User: Which sequence fits this backbone?
RNA sequence: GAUGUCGGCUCAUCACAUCCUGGGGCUGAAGCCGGUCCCAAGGGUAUGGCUGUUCGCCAUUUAAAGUGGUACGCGAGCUGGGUUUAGAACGUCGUGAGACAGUUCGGUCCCUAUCUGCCGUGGACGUUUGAGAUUUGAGAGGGGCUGCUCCUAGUACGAGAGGACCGGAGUGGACGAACCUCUGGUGUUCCGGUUGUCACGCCAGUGGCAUUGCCGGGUAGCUAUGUUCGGAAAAGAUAACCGCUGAAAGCAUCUAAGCGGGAAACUUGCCUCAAGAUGAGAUCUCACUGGGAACUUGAUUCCCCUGAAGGGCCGUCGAAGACUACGACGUUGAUAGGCUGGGUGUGUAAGCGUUGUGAGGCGUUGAGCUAACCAGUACUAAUGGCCCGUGAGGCUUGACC
RNA sequence: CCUUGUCGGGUAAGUUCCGACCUGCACGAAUGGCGUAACGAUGGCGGCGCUGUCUCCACCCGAGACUCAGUGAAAUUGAA
RNA sequence: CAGGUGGUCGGGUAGAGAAUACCAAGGCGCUUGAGAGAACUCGGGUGAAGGAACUAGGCAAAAUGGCACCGUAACUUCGG
RNA sequence: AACCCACUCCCGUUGAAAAGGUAGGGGAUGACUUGUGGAUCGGAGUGAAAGGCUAAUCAAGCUCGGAGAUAGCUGGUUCUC
RNA sequence: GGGGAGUGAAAUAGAACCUGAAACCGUAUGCGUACAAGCAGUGGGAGCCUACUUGUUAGGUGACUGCGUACCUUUUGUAU
């Protein structure tokens, strides 16, 4: 089980002992369970959830009919969490109160999208010399293979292309503050993506 | 100082006036050394009679950088000039006086002799 | 990468753009209906709309400020007398942009950009 | 929403910070704690740069100890900065005052106001 | 870098299976009854039931 | 009827005959270190001074600076120092033109990628009625490094000297991912100063041009040198190795049946992609309920009948982007611009009171912008077309009707 | 040639360099010998200053690339 | 067709100047444009901390740059 | 500076250009640069000398003849049984 | 530049003018083709579609499948 929120900024906490903690905050408007999938009906155990606010003209009849089974009046997106053995009713409401302090938490967002990057900014390649007579190959890559053998480029070769908007998961980030009144997690460090991007928070996979 | 070929003043008492880093010690491809780190120097310039001579491969602790050192609140402390304190093979200072300030990142178990002599 | 960056380059230098968007703005306060390019009209209203807002407060420090960023005497007196007494209770949106087909020579997308309360 | 992260910052911002400008000579009372004690250490010098970003606000003060120039960029609302006190106000007509770095002893003197 | 073999006309025409043109979004003024591009001024100068030029 | 050198650079990929890290046997292995031989290819595996160098010799590192194959990998990726065409010189050889187990200075490196390959990103179609959304995971990729202090313990060990394995922290390095709160960088879209000059009628004030004329700063964004996080533990099956029971072979033997322990290798674990996985899967919801004719009865085509769910075009845009696609929104609207505050940056504008012979001196004042930043909305621009998609979804068999 | 001879200096380290030695494979006195101020877009070395040369690249500004409109090539090609 | 082509004239402010910057008289917008603001390429701008660690080699870039006055080494063929 | 040159970098190499451009660079009262007219030519001129130059050609120009040179070499040689 | 009308024996003899071939480029129609690897054919062969007459035909297409590395020249030998 986890929670769906939004990257609401990047802040700092000063402690009394004098250390500023790098903080991003994740505002989590109370999620609402939509469908509870069991093995008897779906093969695996999971719970659909929905983070609120979607205008009626943007909700389709099929989508609107699904929020209607669960009396939810649901908003933007639907997300699913693989459960081990938890039981959620299909009208319940999961909040930040599912996390405490300390707590190591993994955060998965959509990384910030760099357009089409080169081999230097995408794969950390070393640029060639800028003057010792170098021709027009300043940041172009070097050779892409050996010679007649293998006589082709191998699959996976590191080249340039969409460096960017990819699902990225940051793990083991400590939870410095759980605010159930303003519906906030304050997480120590950086989380992937831009401000307001939808972001998934759940218990650390490595403990 | 920070890297090799870098040239840096001498904050302790006797011998050199300028030393040049010829190796940053520590790791393997290690490329930088800040305050509290151990470099390998050579003596580029020295006084007429002192405990070191010009042209001598020695070891020195970095005490005072222009890149600076950062505190836990986020604050930085940043100096105008690069400076080291030369050491022996005990990694104990050779001179008996320290000139200029140092930082509190240097009052560890090995370098508190430099701190206790410094007019910080 | 231009994340959250404002302003079109329009394939000319920064001093050319500043010359063009005050030639365009001065032409628009004179004629009140000019036919220009569609990206070039979207960038006009970030120049010509703050000149009318400025000319709603008739003042000697506003008339020689509008003259600093129009450098035309005729279109400062067309402001501060007409456009600023028309638009005194209109909170922005002094000009509308109406797309009108494509240019014939190249295939440039045209627009009409037009002040809202024209007498006609 | 920026309204809820500027409200997290406003909760931490209940410390005084008297008014001081670049050019002024100030005494920062810093806390030191290592080798466990809680004593207070002065850092007197010239404010050369202010950052004015709310909780993220900062200032850079320039001192010279023992013939060595030395900068601390402070964090204005950190609890390391215990208190602040302006010694003499300066007359500089410039915001970031980094030209003092090339001046040594008497060219690096600020005028006073009033 | 050149061909070692000329392209077949089967493959020459497979390439240009993506080069077919698209149509414009046209619509009719309710007042005048003339076709114009959607979201554009009419070729007589009408836009949403009003002469603008 | 051309397959263009050596080396460096950039990028690699495989091998194991292993340089480091991991597991072991034997030792002429007390310990600390080693020697030697097995097992092991997961990840790591210098920087410079000389030289055209490969190497090599040296300086200082490191846990370690492995050995090979790949046209002595790689010039339609780079260089062009060596060799090296035309010039020139030195030594030598020849009467000479000229030559070289030789030296020395100088000396043009072309190609817009069709096909295969590769990195990206789409269009079509198919998934058996169509659709909005959420997923299972067959398979595939990434990742996998390590030093130091301390704590056990100067304890085991050793006459002493010297010094542990085995166990848990917390601090680095190199590497990778994210990020921009901080420290900074940039910021030709912001604010100042200032030189020369031309102009705005002139004075003031400003504006063009001079690399942004030159410069001081500097918002947002992007960024590293900044910040945060990572590599696991764990499980299973093993490798050498160590066995337990135990015959063949009254005994002995890890083995022939049977049962185990056992490594960074292998399989999961962690991360990402993933039903074009044509074996095209699964859930939840949604939407569509008229007839004649020939001819051969998946029966189809034809007309009349209507076009839903939804999708798309278009428009306003985006922290999404080469085009796309993806995402948000289109008046039942807050998507962009403006406007209204708030912030930020710059640093006390203009005008006039004031002041001196003049250059120049306080307040208003710590102002107007406002760039990208943060805050409501009917100021402006996002227009209730019919373009697509239809009219209940074949047959056979079986179970329950 | 052996050869990076040997020794001294310069560097942390110097096959180059400087000064020597003479064991001149294979210097030598108008195919001139050995010096030499001034000179040089001359060859080799070393230092200061200066720096994106580099560690290691980051951002920015213009011209192409990409897109749309118009015009419209080339080398190559047995067939695919 | 960024090339070449003898000679003549030559205003203003700054300036030694016919250099150069900005302008007058005079001439001109260089006969494809519009967007967009990826990699990469080109010509530039700024750069933390280092400062030749680059490389065959400081190649390139950065730096120096005027006038007056002071001061100025070895060596010299007495001019430098 | 003009002017004449052409040392270096990069771009350009299907170029804007069958040798340029941009940024720097050498000479710049002289053995200088240049206009116009003239003189010398193919085993022949001219050359501060490189086999350089003699109309984008030079270890012997271009053109037309000997001439369909010669080629022990290359390539090709066409309907059927 | 065409669509007619006229002219002529004929205008698909209309001046780029008799005939008007081939490469090359089109439109219409029938069949094939989006899970299948390579000289592109050949042997086998279903279905579908046209004409006809009986069917044991004729034309088109060719799912699926067996075998299958062009041609010249030169050579001891070339898919090369």
Assistant:
């Amino acid at each position: 089980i986890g929670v769906v929120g939004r990257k609401c900024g990047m802040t700092r906490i000063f402690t009394e002992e004098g250390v500023s903690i790098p903080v991003t905050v994740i505002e989590v408007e109370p999620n609402r369970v939509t469908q509870f999938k069991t093995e008897e009906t779906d093969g695996y155990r999971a719970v659909q959830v929905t983070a609120g606010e979607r205008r009626a003209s943007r909700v389709t009849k099929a989508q609107a009919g699904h929020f209607a089974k669960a009396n939810v009046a649901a908003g933007r997106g639907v997300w699913e969490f693989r459960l081990g053995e938890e039981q959620y009713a299909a009208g319940d409401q999961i909040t930040v109160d599912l996390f405490q302090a300390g707590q190591m938490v993994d955060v998965t967002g959509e990384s910030k999208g760099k357009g089409f990057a080169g081999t230097i900014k995408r794969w950390n390649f070393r640029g060639q010399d800028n003057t010792h007579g170098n021709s027009v190959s300043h940041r172009v890559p070097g050779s892409i293979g050996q010679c007649q053998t293998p006589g082709r480029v191998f699959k996976g070769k590191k080249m340039s292309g969409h460096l960017g908007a990819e699902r990225v998961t940051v793990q083991s980030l400590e939870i410095v503050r759980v605010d159930a009144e303003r519906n906030l997690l304050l997480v120590k460090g950086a989380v992937p993506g831009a401000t307001g991007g939808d972001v998934i928070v759940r218990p650390a996979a490595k403990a | 100082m920070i890297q090799t070929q870098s040239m840096l003043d001498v904050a302790d008492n006797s011998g050199a006036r300028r030393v040049m880093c010829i190796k940053v010690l520590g790791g393997s491809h290690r490329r930088y050394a800040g305050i509290g780190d151990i470099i390998k120097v050579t003596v580029k310039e020295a006084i007429p009679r002192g405990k070191v001579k010009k042209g001598q491969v020695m070891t020195a602790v970095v005490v005072r950088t222009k890149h600076g050192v950062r505190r836990t609140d986020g604050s930085i402390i940043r100096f105008d000039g690069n400076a080291a304190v030369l050491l022996n093979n005990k990694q104990e200072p050779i001179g008996t006086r320290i000139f200029g300030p140092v930082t509190r990142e240097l009052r560890t178990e090995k370098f508190m002799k430099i701190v206790s002599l410094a007019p910080e | 990468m231009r994340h959250r960056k404002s302003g079109r380059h329009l394939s000319r230098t920064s001093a050319h753009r500043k010359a063009m968007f005050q030639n365009m703005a001065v032409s628009l306060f004179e004629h009140e209906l000019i036919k220009t390019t569609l990206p070039k009209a979207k960038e006009l209203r970030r120049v010509a709309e703050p000149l009318i807002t400025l000319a709603k407060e008739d003042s000697v420090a506003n008339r020689r400020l509008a003259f600093d960023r129009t450098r035309s005497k005729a279109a400062v007196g067309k402001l501060f007398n007409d456009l600023g007494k028309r638009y005194a209770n209109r909170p922005g949106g002094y000009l509308r942009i109406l797309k009108c087909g494509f240019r014939a020579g190249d295939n440039a997308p045209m627009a009409y950009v037009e002040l809202v309360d024209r007498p006609v | 929403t920026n309204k809820i992260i500027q409200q997290i910052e406003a909760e931490q911002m209940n410390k005084e910070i008297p008014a001081f400008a670049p050019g002024d000579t100030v005494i920062v009372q810093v806390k030191v704690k290592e080798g466990d004690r809680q004593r207070l250490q002065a850092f007197e010098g010239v404010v050369i740069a202010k950052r004015n970003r709310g909780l993220n606000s900062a200032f850079t003060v320039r001192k010279i100890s023992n013939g060595v120039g030395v900068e601390r960029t402070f964090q204005t609302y950190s609890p390391i900065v215990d208190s602040l006190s302006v010694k003499r106000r300066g007359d500089v007509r410039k915001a970031k005052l980094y030209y003092l770095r090339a001046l040594s002893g008497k060219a690096a003197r600020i005028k006073e106001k009033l | 870098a050149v061909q070692q073999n000329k392209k077949s006309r089967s493959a020459r025409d497979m390439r240009r299976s993506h080069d077919a043109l698209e149509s414009n979004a046209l619509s009719v003024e309710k007042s005048t009854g003339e076709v114009h591009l959607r979201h554009h001024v009419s070729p007589d100068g009408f836009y949403r039931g009003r002469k603008v030029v």
